[PDB]
Design a protein around this ligand. Structure first.
Ligand SMILES: [Hg+2]
Ligand SMILES: [Hg+2]
Ligand SMILES: [Hg+2]
Ligand SMILES: [Hg+2]
Length: 265
């Protein structure tokens, strides 16, 4: 919104597609983020000029606190480097959170569990919610930021919708029939503006309570409700599987030029 400065980079080629092997835009014109689709220098400029702050939230309960060290250290190496970052670690074991050295402009808050959502509105511009038993292995940056985004589940990105493991019982609020659905999104990596993320979590929480009262639990719990939400409220960006992969279970296919955030080991 202030002007970008002069920049020298390769001219985009109107008659040369970015990738010829994958879909790079959804039918509602939301970009699908794959390596090769973005110039990170231009994006870093746009977001820095807005002095963007990104909150990264993780839930580490019981034995999962053991994954915090690697998660945070690799995040320090690959997540939003150069931008303001605020980590929010929700845990039942505050004292077990490892002492990780953070780069300038980056901070960490420990929130005990078992905090007011209005705090997020005043501290960060975007929220990124991921699982803790993971590690960053490559660049995860501002190219993912947008009002609302979901990530393509690694095991279903090439599947037909009828094969998606959506909740199929009409008694559940997460219900999605066989002739509906765009993609199968992961519960472990989603985000967007604080406002949009709060809307999504508020909708999910209410939908899960209705299911509880009706004596039913969606097949894949929160992930099933996330999928129903994103089916009805289209994400403004969709992240490719590069953003959440499991190399042990899925290897390293040619269509993935980078494996950015992966399951541990
Ligand atoms: Hg391109
Ligand atoms: Hg979150
Ligand atoms: Hg929920
Ligand atoms: Hg949700």
């Amino acid at each position: 919104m202030v002007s970008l400065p002069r920049m020298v980079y390769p001219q985009p080629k109107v008659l040369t597609p970015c990738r010829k092997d994958v879909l790079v835009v959804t039918p509602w014109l939301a970009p699908i983020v794959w390596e090769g689709t973005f110039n990170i220098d231009i994006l870093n400029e746009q977001f820095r000029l807005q002095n963007t702050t990104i909150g990264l939230t993780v839930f580490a309960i019981k034995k999962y606190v053991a994954f915090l060290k690697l998660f945070l250290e690799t995040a320090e190496k690959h997540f939003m480097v150069g931008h303001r970052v605020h980590y929010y670690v929700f845990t039942d074991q505050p004292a077990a959170v490892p002492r990780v050295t953070l780069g300038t402009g980056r901070q960490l808050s420990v929130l005990e569990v078992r905090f007011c959502e209005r705090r997020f509105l005043s501290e960060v511009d975007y929220l990124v919610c991921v699982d803790v038993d993971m590690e960053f292995r490559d660049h995860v940056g501002v190219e993912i930021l947008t009002p609302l985004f979901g990530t393509l589940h690694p095991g279903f990105y090439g599947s037909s919708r009828e094969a998606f493991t959506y909740e199929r019982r009409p008694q559940s609020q997460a219900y999605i029939p066989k002739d509906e659905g765009d993609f199968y999104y992961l519960g472990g990596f989603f985000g967007g503006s604080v406002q949009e993320v709060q809307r999504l979590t508020r909708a999910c929480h209410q939908a899960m309570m209705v299911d509880q009262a009706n004596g039913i639990e969606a097949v894949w719990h929160d992930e099933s409700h996330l999928n129903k939400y994103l089916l009805r409220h289209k994400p403004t960006k969709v992240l490719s599987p590069e953003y959440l992969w499991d190399q042990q279970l899925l290897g390293w296919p040619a269509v993935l030029r980078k494996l950015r955030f992966t399951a541990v080991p």
